[PDB]
Write a protein that holds these residues in place. Structure first.
Motif, mmCIF file in Angstrom:
data_model
loop_
_atom_site.group_PDB
_atom_site.id
_atom_site.type_symbol
_atom_site.label_atom_id
_atom_site.label_comp_id
_atom_site.label_asym_id
_atom_site.label_seq_id
_atom_site.Cartn_x
_atom_site.Cartn_y
_atom_site.Cartn_z
ATOM 1 N N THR A 1 -8.510 9.488 -9.154
ATOM 2 C CA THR A 1 -9.606 8.798 -9.863
ATOM 3 C C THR A 1 -10.601 8.109 -8.941
ATOM 4 O O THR A 1 -11.706 7.786 -9.365
ATOM 5 N N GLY A 2 -10.207 7.798 -7.704
ATOM 6 C CA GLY A 2 -10.935 6.857 -6.846
ATOM 7 C C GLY A 2 -10.881 5.400 -7.332
ATOM 8 O O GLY A 2 -11.512 4.529 -6.736
ATOM 9 N N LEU A 3 -10.130 5.108 -8.399
ATOM 10 C CA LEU A 3 -9.988 3.768 -8.975
ATOM 11 C C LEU A 3 -8.636 3.118 -8.670
ATOM 12 O O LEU A 3 -8.574 1.900 -8.571
ATOM 13 N N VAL A 4 -7.584 3.906 -8.453
ATOM 14 C CA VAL A 4 -6.276 3.448 -7.956
ATOM 15 C C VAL A 4 -5.584 4.553 -7.170
ATOM 16 O O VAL A 4 -5.778 5.734 -7.453
ATOM 17 N N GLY A 5 -4.712 4.180 -6.236
ATOM 18 C CA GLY A 5 -3.750 5.112 -5.660
ATOM 19 C C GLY A 5 -2.592 5.394 -6.616
ATOM 20 O O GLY A 5 -2.218 4.534 -7.412
ATOM 21 N N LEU A 6 -2.009 6.584 -6.531
ATOM 22 C CA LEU A 6 -0.769 6.957 -7.203
ATOM 23 C C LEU A 6 0.402 6.235 -6.543
ATOM 24 O O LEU A 6 0.529 6.243 -5.325
ATOM 25 N N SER A 7 1.259 5.607 -7.332
ATOM 26 C CA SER A 7 2.352 4.784 -6.819
ATOM 27 C C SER A 7 3.534 5.651 -6.376
ATOM 28 O O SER A 7 4.216 6.190 -7.245
ATOM 29 N N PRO A 8 3.814 5.856 -5.076
ATOM 30 C CA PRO A 8 4.685 6.948 -4.647
ATOM 31 C C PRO A 8 6.113 6.802 -5.153
ATOM 32 O O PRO A 8 6.746 7.775 -5.551
ATOM 33 N N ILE A 9 6.582 5.561 -5.247
ATOM 34 C CA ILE A 9 7.858 5.213 -5.859
ATOM 35 C C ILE A 9 8.016 5.830 -7.254
ATOM 36 O O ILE A 9 9.081 6.343 -7.590
ATOM 37 N N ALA A 10 6.950 5.866 -8.050
ATOM 38 C CA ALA A 10 7.006 6.395 -9.400
ATOM 39 C C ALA A 10 7.279 7.899 -9.410
ATOM 40 O O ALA A 10 7.896 8.406 -10.339
ATOM 41 N N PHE A 11 6.861 8.622 -8.377
ATOM 42 C CA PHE A 11 7.087 10.057 -8.275
ATOM 43 C C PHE A 11 8.435 10.375 -7.644
ATOM 44 O O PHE A 11 9.144 11.266 -8.103
ATOM 45 N N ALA A 12 8.820 9.609 -6.630
ATOM 46 C CA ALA A 12 10.064 9.810 -5.902
ATOM 47 C C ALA A 12 11.332 9.599 -6.752
ATOM 48 O O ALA A 12 12.429 9.992 -6.355
ATOM 49 N N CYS A 13 11.199 8.982 -7.925
ATOM 50 C CA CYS A 13 12.312 8.580 -8.777
ATOM 51 C C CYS A 13 13.363 9.682 -9.019
ATOM 52 O O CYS A 13 14.554 9.383 -9.062
ATOM 53 N N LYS A 14 12.985 10.958 -9.162
ATOM 54 C CA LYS A 14 13.959 12.026 -9.447
ATOM 55 C C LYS A 14 14.800 12.411 -8.246
ATOM 56 O O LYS A 14 16.022 12.383 -8.343
ATOM 57 N N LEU B 1 0.818 -1.198 0.000
ATOM 58 C CA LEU B 1 0.000 0.000 0.000
ATOM 59 C C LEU B 1 0.859 1.259 0.000
ATOM 60 O O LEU B 1 0.609 2.159 -0.789
ATOM 61 N N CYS B 2 1.898 1.318 0.828
ATOM 62 C CA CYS B 2 2.806 2.458 0.838
ATOM 63 C C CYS B 2 3.644 2.524 -0.431
ATOM 64 O O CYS B 2 3.800 3.589 -1.017
ATOM 65 N N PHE B 3 4.202 1.401 -0.859
ATOM 66 C CA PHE B 3 5.208 1.401 -1.907
ATOM 67 C C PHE B 3 4.601 1.631 -3.291
ATOM 68 O O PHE B 3 5.122 2.414 -4.075
ATOM 69 N N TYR B 4 3.475 0.983 -3.571
ATOM 70 C CA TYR B 4 2.786 1.032 -4.856
ATOM 71 C C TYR B 4 1.518 1.876 -4.839
ATOM 72 O O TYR B 4 0.776 1.908 -5.818
ATOM 73 N N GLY B 5 1.188 2.497 -3.711
ATOM 74 C CA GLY B 5 -0.089 3.187 -3.539
ATOM 75 C C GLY B 5 -1.296 2.245 -3.513
ATOM 76 O O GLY B 5 -2.429 2.704 -3.427
ATOM 77 N N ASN B 6 -1.088 0.934 -3.644
ATOM 78 C CA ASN B 6 -2.134 -0.064 -3.801
ATOM 79 C C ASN B 6 -1.640 -1.413 -3.291
ATOM 80 O O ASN B 6 -0.473 -1.762 -3.465
ATOM 81 N N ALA B 7 -2.552 -2.209 -2.752
ATOM 82 C CA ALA B 7 -2.310 -3.585 -2.353
ATOM 83 C C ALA B 7 -3.552 -4.419 -2.655
ATOM 84 O O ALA B 7 -4.666 -3.908 -2.548
ATOM 85 N N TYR B 8 -3.370 -5.685 -3.002
ATOM 86 C CA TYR B 8 -4.437 -6.570 -3.446
ATOM 87 C C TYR B 8 -4.326 -7.910 -2.732
ATOM 88 O O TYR B 8 -3.233 -8.454 -2.608
ATOM 89 N N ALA B 9 -5.450 -8.477 -2.312
ATOM 90 C CA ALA B 9 -5.501 -9.833 -1.801
ATOM 91 C C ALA B 9 -6.636 -10.589 -2.472
ATOM 92 O O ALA B 9 -7.727 -10.043 -2.656
ATOM 93 N N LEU B 10 -6.375 -11.847 -2.799
ATOM 94 C CA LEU B 10 -7.416 -12.808 -3.095
ATOM 95 C C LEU B 10 -8.259 -13.004 -1.843
ATOM 96 O O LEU B 10 -7.722 -13.242 -0.761
ATOM 97 N N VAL B 11 -9.569 -12.956 -2.028
ATOM 98 C CA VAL B 11 -10.587 -13.252 -1.029
ATOM 99 C C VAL B 11 -11.192 -14.608 -1.338
ATOM 100 O O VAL B 11 -11.585 -14.871 -2.474
ATOM 101 N N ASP B 12 -11.309 -15.459 -0.328
ATOM 102 C CA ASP B 12 -11.964 -16.758 -0.430
ATOM 103 C C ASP B 12 -13.095 -16.881 0.593
ATOM 104 O O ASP B 12 -12.989 -16.353 1.699
ATOM 105 N N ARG B 13 -14.171 -17.586 0.235
ATOM 106 C CA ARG B 13 -15.407 -17.689 1.016
ATOM 107 C C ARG B 13 -16.079 -19.056 0.893
ATOM 108 O O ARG B 13 -15.938 -19.734 -0.122
ATOM 109 N N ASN B 14 -16.805 -19.469 1.929
ATOM 110 C CA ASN B 14 -17.496 -20.758 1.988
ATOM 111 C C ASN B 14 -18.805 -20.767 1.180
ATOM 112 O O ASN B 14 -19.200 -19.770 0.574
ATOM 113 N N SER B 15 -19.516 -21.893 1.214
ATOM 114 C CA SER B 15 -20.832 -22.061 0.586
ATOM 115 C C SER B 15 -21.896 -21.093 1.119
ATOM 116 O O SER B 15 -22.743 -20.631 0.354
ATOM 117 N N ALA B 16 -21.838 -20.723 2.401
ATOM 118 C CA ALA B 16 -22.698 -19.702 2.998
ATOM 119 C C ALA B 16 -22.300 -18.260 2.610
ATOM 120 O O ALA B 16 -22.986 -17.307 2.984
#
Lengths: 346, 346, 346, 346, 346
Positions: free
Chosen positions: E138-151, E73-88
């Motif tokens: 956008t509300g669709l992704v975070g800005l990846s802070p590493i990509a800006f810090a590059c300079k 979340l800090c490094f890429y502005g975003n983090a993702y996990a697979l969610v798994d759920r039972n029959s209920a």
């Protein structure tokens, strides 16, 4: 050097402004004194009290008049007003007179105020000229402080002119035209003036000519890397302030009064005692000495009110009034009179 | 030099802004006064109160008029309004006039306000010109401060102008141009201009080529690394401030008052007692001297309110009110009136 | 120089932003005043209160409108809105107008707001243009502060460009090219520039070129060892701030308000009294002077609420409320109203 | 220059991050309000509350949406969402739109939101675009701060690029390669370009040779030992911060606030009153102006909660609660509600 | 430049470590909320509470999982996990996914998480990918802070490499091998290259040769008399810290937080409010927005516990608990629960 060029020094302007205006802001009150030694403040029905507090003449405010008198008193060591009085001998007008036109000369045991109006000599007695008469050895006139300040003022205006001129020349430093031994034509020599009139002013920046001779030319002036061109400027403010006796932190130096008194009241007390007090006495005693009739001396009296300066903050004045509570040093009514609140049973 | 070029100095602009604005921000009230010296603040039904508080004329606000008047009074030492009055002789309008177009002269024992309206030369009485008449030796007119300040202002604008154009020259110093060691044609001399002179701009960089006849060119500017340049600017702020008498930390310079009281209330007392007070006096006194009729003197009294400046913080004001609640120097109703709260039994 | 280039100075941007936005954040309340002198705050049912507090027109928020007006008032010394009113004469819309397109000209005793819409002259009376009219000598317009600030802004934009372009050139300092006597071919003379253009721009690092003459070159830039190239950059912020009267510690200088007041409340009190207060009065008095009908003067009144600034910390406000406990200066209900807590028996 | 290259500046990134995040972190609530002015916080069963607090759309969180909106509002002075509403006309979705693709124009007396969608030019009403409309002279659109900041940002990126490239060239100063007086073949030139120029890289410390033409090669860089280099970088942080109005110690510079209150709560009040407050107003006001229907104005009221910032330490909060317990400004139940403790008889 | 070389900067490493680890140390609690608005903390019998507090999957700890998510979340502005759920439909596993392999693309009104596993495209709905989605327009992704810090990172690694290499070269200054005009053979001259390389290398102190032409050598290294080689190294730390918003006294600069708050609790409060708070909200709201079923919203809730940071010292916490004594804001049992002491009659 002249008085107006001296008055154009900011320090001088400020000092004169401050002293005169402050003493002009003070309330001035007149009192009838009972035989049991109680003061009654008198009303604008009294002729002298009206003359003083309401109107000195058909052209001026009281404040305005006191200010005007005090400016001359500070600047010339002396100030003079025409005194006018009715058939009963009571005064009815006061009118300031330019001190520079005044002379005072003794005439046997007598004195004549010789007033040079243009080319006419309006001559007067001690009974019709007020003469506030400042600090001086004779008791007959004050020493004119402007006349003494002239040398330090001379230094100050000299520096100011140099400082102006350096920047006005765009900091193009003056050059020795150090040279060599080639024969120059008189026109080659003429170019040294002829090409120019801008080494002070204009942007001939990269371009200031020399002839077909190369030459070795170099700067003459010391540069204001001579730190006196700052430090000396600061120093003069004290010199000028000392002719008026003004605490330099009120004028603008360093920051603030470093080890002397903490709160505003201490500053005011200091400024009163060491600077403002004399003028109060000069006014009050002159009024008593010349304006009040001899039969009314001790009965009739006048005072400036100091509380407008001696006013501490809300917390200190609250604590002070509370300290009158027990001890009983005032009634609620007396305290309500200090801030014109309506009286109340007590 | 001219007044607008002077007023373009940030210091001068700020000083005038501050003073004129602050005194225009104060509440101004009138009391009728009983013979037992009880005050009674008067209503907007009273013509004078309405004039002073609601509307001076059919173009302006009270605040807006007081501001404009005070700006002239500071800048020119004098300010003037045309008065107007109804068939009862009671005042009904005030309108400002240019102090730069006005003149006042004695004419016999009388006085005339000569006003240069455009290409005409109107004349007016003391009966119809209000004339706020500031600080000056005659008691008839104020000394115009702009006239005295012109030299230090001259230095300030000289420094400012020089300081700019150094960077406008791409920070490159003035140079002596020796024309080498042999004479050249007037066209080759003209080509010195073609070769050079654009050194004030950026892009020249390397084409500063010495021609094939010796040459000996070098700098003649001192560099702003001289010990004046920066410090010089700082110093001059104080010089201009001294014509108006404003404490330089309020002018935004350097460091704030170390040694006359730290609390905001003490800053306000200092500023009041040493700077604002005289203007308050001039307004209130002029109104009482010219606008209030003689029969109403001591009955009617105009005053400003100081509390908008003398306002303490929450802690101090709470302690203060408690110290009047005990001791009993106020009712709850009086204190609730100060912050317009509804009254209660007390 | 132009207004937009001036507005691109960070200091100017900040000052305008701050003042306008702060006065736009304040609650503005309207009151009906009973004959016993009690305030009732009025509701959004009142037409003027709705116009002010809810909606000025079919395009804008109240906050947004006050902000927009105040920006022009600060920037141009003046702001103008079209006023619209119903058949009963009550106002129903307000709409800001660009001050740069406005002229105001007197017409005999009357006044015309001459609005230059493009190439058309929409001419209006005092009854349909609001005109907030800032600080100025005439009482007819405010002085446009941007017009005065132009010179110090000129110095600021000059230094900024030099500072940039020095690093845009990679600090490759400009040079004399020199030898003394060899014939350069016109191609050698071409190549002295034509090899390059990257002496300004690109990485020609270890390899600027001579032609076939060895050369004896030397530099002409002073280096930002010029103390102005830091000290002056700092200094100019004060100059710009002085046109708006903003305390420079709010802007960014030195650190914090060194000897002036301790806690946040003292800073706010200072900022209110010495800077923010005038705008409050200009708004409130203009509303009273033009928008409220003459028959409703004294009955109807409007105030900004200051408590959003005058808010002290939790400890001080707790101590304050406790100090109301005994003394009884509020009920619990009145204090609960200050923070919208539900009322409770008391 | 471009917006992304600007946003890559650490200052700019941080300012936008801070403000948008902090206001997105605040709790936001709605009250229904009784005619006696009692609040009643509304539940997630209410559609507007659900929209604001649980879900703005089928892609986002409330926090996440407020953040995104606020980022545009800061960066472009403006932010836009497409509104959507059900068959009852009540709102059911909000979706952000690019401020860079949006335009707003007056069209007759009406307005059109022109949106450039990709290669199409959609048009919308005030009825369906939310438009948060920041600081600006028209009251119709905000001034895009990025557009004004571009020059100081230009200076910052110029220095940053120069600073890199100096160390990237192994900290070797630029040189005039001067050989002597021999004519060079194009291959001899190519060998100056290949024996030499390569020095500006890393490893070649050892050998850098001079041919029998004798050479005169010398440096033309000033060296970052110049008085600007470091201080320059520091100074520019303040310049960029002033476009956003953030106190530089919060931006992580130099030294923290000495002289406006030391306690964390006073830092928070300062930041609130001088920086955050206006955004809070813009949100709450926009919601009340466009989203709450006219019939519900004064009944329904949206507000943020400040306590998350105004939070004191353990000692101060304990003392505060005790000072409400005595005096009785709260019940234990109210105080226990603040920290969600179970209630008790009280 | 690349992400791993950036991560090798100590400042970046520390910031990421600190933020992620601190939020991973906090207790996370889950609550059932009664209709009377009382919290019950729930047990490890509840499926979601067990998933969260005890075990996210068959490979990981809860702490470990939250940490891992937050790093992305800090490094890429975003983090993702697979969610798994039972029959209920109740969730039963969570598994982090590398953000660099993720894409998210809209598909008509829908969204697809396009996961590039190696060369395979695992495509998923909003119902099975969690997506913590940081700061962005956008509300669709975070800005990846590493990509800006590059300079700024680019500047930092340029200095660091140079600084190494200078000392690795034994601080021997690189040399122009200057001479004159005497002939030597190319084989003689080649012995420079043949012999040396230890000028960049190590042990040959003395016999750096010359071929037999006397020589006149000079250096070209600037020396770290260039103060940037110290001062600028220090300066870079702020630039990098500003991408994460970390108070630099926690990182290592100057000494300690000079004028900001006294005791440790104030530092923690500051760090929470200005830096840590957003992540708390992002976690808690994401859980509420996606993991809790819509029917259980308002009933079921989750909070991090702050007391592990807000913990004052022994003296302050004793004083605090004593202040609960009278006031009665806790029972002894409630206070004993805060430190798991056995309950006691009260």
């Amino acid at each position: 050097i002249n008085d107006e060029r001296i008055l154009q020094i900011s320090t001088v302007w400020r000092c004169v402004s401050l002293i005169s205006t402050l003493t002009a802001c003070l309330p001035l009150d007149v009192f009838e004194t009972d035989q049991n030694d109680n003061r009654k403040k008198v009303d604008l029905s009294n002729p002298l009290a009206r003359l003083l507090r309401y109107s000195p003449n058909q052209y001026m405010t009281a404040q305005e008049f006191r200010e005007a008198m005090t400016m001359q008193l500070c600047f010339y060591g002396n100030a003079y007003a025409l005194v006018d009085r009715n058939s009963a001998g009571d005064v009815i007008s006061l009118l300031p007179l330019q001190s520079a036109n005044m002379d005072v000369k003794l005439v046997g045991k007598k004195v004549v105020y010789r007033y040079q109006r243009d080319s006419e000599y309006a001559d007067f007695s001690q009974k019709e000229i007020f003469h506030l008469k400042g600090f001086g050895f004779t008791g007959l006139v004050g020493l004119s402080p402007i006349a003494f300040a002239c040398k330090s003022a001379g230094v100050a205006v000299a520096m100011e002119d140099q400082q102006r001129d350096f920047f006005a020349n765009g900091a193009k430093s003056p050059q020795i035209l150090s040279t060599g031994e080639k024969v120059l034509t008189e026109q080659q020599r003429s170019q040294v003036e002829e090409n120019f009139k801008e080494i002070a002013g204009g942007p001939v920046k990269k371009r200031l000519w020399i002839l077909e001779a190369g030459f070795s030319t170099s700067a003459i002036g010391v540069t204001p890397q001579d730190a006196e061109m700052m430090a000396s400027r600061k120093f003069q403010v004290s010199e000028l302030a000392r002719f008026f006796g003004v605490p330099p932190h009120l004028v603008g130096d360093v920051e603030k009064s470093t080890s002397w008194g903490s709160g505003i009241e201490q500053q005011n007390l200091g400024f009163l005692q060491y600077t403002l007090q004399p003028y109060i006495s000069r006014w009050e005693n002159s009024i008593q000495r010349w304006l009040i009739p001899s039969k009314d001396v001790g009965r009739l009296h006048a005072e400036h009110n100091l509380d407008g300066l001696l006013r501490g903050d809300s917390a200190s004045r609250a604590a002070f009034m509370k300290a009158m509570g027990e001890s009983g040093l005032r009634t609620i009514n007396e305290m309500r009179r200090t801030d014109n609140m309506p009286p109340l049973p007590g």
